[PDB]
Design a protein around this ligand. Structure first.
Ligand SMILES: Cc1ncc(COP(=O)(O)O)c(C/N=C(\C=C\OCCN)C(=O)O)c1O
Ligand SMILES: Cc1ncc(COP(=O)(O)O)c(C/N=C(\C=C\OCCN)C(=O)O)c1O
Lengths: 419, 410
């Protein structure tokens, strides 16, 4: 006899925890920085969390049960989905409108993307994802679904943006390889690039999805963190300009309050689908990952406070843009370039010029030095499947001004030695 | 036009079914004491309101906490709360507690961990209709029934386990475990300690898993009649036996908090613990909710008394409905736990068939404006049985519902 057996999924490494993204976070837990009693400790810059605006929520909740405890309906509180739909309209500046009856809540966007993948792709089918992308997709999209990721290659020529030749090449290469493609999943604005997607690129992408008869999933979890509202194009805007419901039926939006509101612990995700069958199916499936009715009830009033949401979103954009400029201008003093970003909680930092040669193990060696001599946890670009080595994602939104300044000192101090 | 996955177009969502057709019909004309007492009274939903008044009489760091270990305070509260429910007959290490969004998530997640697509789990009939979705819809895993009949109050026998296993072998389906409900839904009955030990020996001999969904453990009328598989493991000394036992629990039924989506897996298998915790990223409990409940669920004073009083009211509510149904000439199976009774209407049947049972089920939904669950939606092997929920309603509403059934038998 042998030890009682677990499933293939259970012994698979697709949980993604043998990886630089997880090891650097682990190195942070063993020696965390602290201004007062460990200024030599590891500064956490590898986690995309937003604390720069959190005082607005603290100030707001200061100034202001049986029903929710019994409410477990898979639609979610009608009151909260109105708050969510209105909050999403405010993020997009009225260039889109959201019917609360189409809102499906999930425990964060982690749940939403896996759920949508269950709905749009069979096991052994594939989704196209532009590189570089959020390492967590390698778990979220694949671990339990049997679905595969086919990369859409992007390089620095066009600032890592989708080109029609890369969409056609990724699709056709897979189709010639007897891999069935079911859709494209994009991050808009991008993680890890911190960059909006240009409107015409999204329009060509939607046209491409029509021509191949595939789906378009747009993960817009950083939409409220675009530095300037007018530079963001949600796929909702491209679809609102179309009454052809035959076209609408393939577009789905993933959103979450984890990044824009800085509430990751509350696990508020949503799917907004223009496909009525996906809505009905996603909602039944959300039974496996429902949002606490307590937090829905708490957040509903705050997220419907049109006065407060207008102010929060405006101010959150400015503080993130302000941190982006702080860190990008700090790195330029040290002789380090970043991609020009216009959104998100992270900058995309080019260190390829410090490498042995453009190889993967050279990037990890450098990452090891930044993690052990500089005591900074940042994410190596190859764990985001970047096509060029030496790029690093650096998060700037989860820390105090001074902690960012000290982190900048260590890097500036490190470049002086290497010259 | 776009294609969706087989999972998306599948019937396994289970809503083209009487359990959800009657729950539907309730929404179109819902009862309300104030402005519609002729409306549909909901008796098809196992929810517990009878003890909620006891709860009523009783930030930056939380918002940022998204760790899949869960709050340590809340894992401590859950573990001590689960020990109090079992009367100290078992001990729960808070470090092994894995939280999920309800037991709905927990059973599906465990199914992902314990069985491959196209393998099977054995499930005793009758069983919770939601399992037909939860264990199968996204997992590709099959349910092979363990048949039970009324001769022994629908309890598992060593023989039924073995022929059920043989049935899967004939279909070239590999059995990976048995999932039981302890106490039973829809029977409302504890499982005898002897039966659980014989079940565990069967799982050892076939080297398969045993999942015990004990979401109704706090609703056993007389605490000593309940045997958790945790008590049986507490006194086993072979690790080969322990390693296959996993407990699912939730605060939805015993505490009446279904909306907060607090589920847990307590597994005696360290790799299931670690895998369940990684997999719980897809279905985490709100940290706000963990925090609020940690203080309440660690107040052993309040919890010891809450558990005691909830047992007494569910027993009396059980007595109210079963004695109400007997007055109308209807027998219920002898139950001792849960939020529902198991009602035999087999004598009003047109043809001792499944078609006949649903036809009769249609009458109670239309004419009586009562949603109750037909036993064939629980895969009962005998026709004419119905699950009737009694804890999701007021005193007044239950009396009104009984009166409607009483008149129908006239
Ligand atoms: C593009 C994208 N989608 C979904 C998620 C999941 O977020 P949720 O709504 O479940 O809270 C992330 C989280 N981004 C990160 C994940 C951090 O770990 C926590 C995962 N919940 C990151 O550091 O890049 C993300 O970047
Ligand atoms: C044995 C069992 N396990 C798990 C669950 C789900 O519990 P939760 O996910 O809240 O922790 C139920 C709910 N059973 C019912 C609840 C249904 O509500 C709607 C979802 N089907 C029922 O009517 O039998 C159950 O009976």
């Amino acid at each position: 006899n042998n030890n009682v057996e677990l499933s293939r999924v259970a012994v698979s490494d697709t949980h993604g925890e043998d990886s630089p993204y997880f090891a650097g976070w682990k190195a942070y837990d063993e020696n965390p920085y602290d201004e007062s009693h460990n200024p030599s400790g590891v500064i956490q810059m590898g986690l995309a969390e937003n604390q720069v605006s959190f005082d607005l929520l603290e100030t707001y909740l200061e100034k202001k049960f049986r029903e929710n405890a019994l409410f477990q309906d898979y639609h979610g509180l009608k009151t909260f989905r109105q708050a969510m739909a209105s909050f999403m309209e405010q993020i997009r500046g009225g260039k889109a409108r959201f019917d609360p009856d189409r809102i499906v809540l999930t425990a964060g966007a982690t749940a939403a993307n896996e759920l949508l993948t269950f709905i749009l792709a069979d096991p052994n089918d594939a989704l196209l994802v532009p590189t570089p992308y959020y390492p967590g997709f390698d778990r979220d999209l694949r671990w339990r679904t049997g679905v595969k990721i086919v990369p859409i290659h992007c390089d620095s020529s066009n600032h890592f943006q989708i080109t029609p030749e890369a969409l056609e090449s990724a699709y056709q290469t897979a189709r010639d390889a007897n891999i069935r493609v079911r859709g494209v999943l994009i991050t808009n604005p991008s993680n890890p690039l911190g960059a909006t997607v240009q409107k015409k690129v999204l329009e060509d992408l939607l046209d491409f999805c029509v021509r191949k008869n595939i789906h378009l999933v747009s993960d817009e979890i950083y939409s409220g963190s675009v530095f300037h509202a007018s530079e963001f194009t949600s796929v909702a805007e491209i679809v609102e300009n179309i009454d052809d419901v035959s076209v609408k039926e393939r577009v789905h939006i993933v959103y979450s309050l984890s990044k824009d509101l800085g509430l990751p612990g509350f696990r508020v995700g949503t799917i907004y689908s223009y496909n009525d069958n996906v809505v009905r199916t996603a909602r039944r499936m959300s039974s496996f990952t429902l949002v606490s009715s307590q937090t829905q009830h708490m957040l509903a009033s705050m997220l419907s406070d049109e006065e407060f949401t207008e102010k929060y979103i405006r101010i959150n954009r400015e503080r993130l843009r302000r941190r982006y400029d702080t860190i990008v201008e700090g790195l330029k003093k040290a002789g380090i370039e970043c991609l020009k970003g216009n959104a998100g909680l992270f900058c995309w930092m080019n260190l390829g010029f410090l490498l042995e040669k453009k190889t993967k193990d050279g990037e990890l060696q450098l990452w090891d030095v930044i993690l052990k001599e500089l005591n900074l946890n940042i994410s190596p670009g190859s764990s985001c499947h970047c096509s060029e080595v030496g790029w690093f994602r650096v998060c700037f939104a989860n820390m105090s001004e001074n902690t960012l300044e000290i982190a900048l000192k260590r890097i500036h101090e490190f470049m002086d030695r290497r010259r």
